Amino acid sequence: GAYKYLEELQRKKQSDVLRFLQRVRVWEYRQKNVIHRAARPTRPDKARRLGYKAKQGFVIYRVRVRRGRSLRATAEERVGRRAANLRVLNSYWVNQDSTYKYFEVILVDPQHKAIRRDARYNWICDPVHKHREARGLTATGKKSRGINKGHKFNNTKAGRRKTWKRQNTLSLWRYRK
């Protein structure tokens, strides 16, 4: 498949061809609003491996965030606030420069009957998935939360506040031990 070629080409990020593409695309986006609807992703391989599919129900948005609450987290929060009726699934980096960093976020509309009847995507329609970025359930949010296995995440394996509450509580049984 061609997607392997796309991934390999994207591996050499500092190639003169990708440099030209990035500097052209950033200049083109500089003339557009901060957040706007994207007709199609500029990195089809990344979106496809992130779960995006070219079918009625998916939406691609490009958002610009000031350089220097991670930048990806801020972008996800902004797109979720603007796209209140859509659910943020994942996002990927698409460009950067000395002033701004650009990320592309793919959204799925749970109201569209195509998604509702999609056995592989109807899970997002559950109300528990509302505003995934708000609770940091996205890929970037989970990574920032330190959720992982091993000694490197013992203090933040699942919930930094939960462990503090557990170690601060006084468990007393009916018959004292």
Binding site: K4, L9, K12, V17, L18
Partner: peptide, 24 residues
Amino acid sequence: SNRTKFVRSLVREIAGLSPYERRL
């Protein structure tokens, strides 16, 4: 995989050398 190696070589020839690689 031979195909993966071929694709990697093709990408290497297409992308040329990186600015830091060009110093060599």
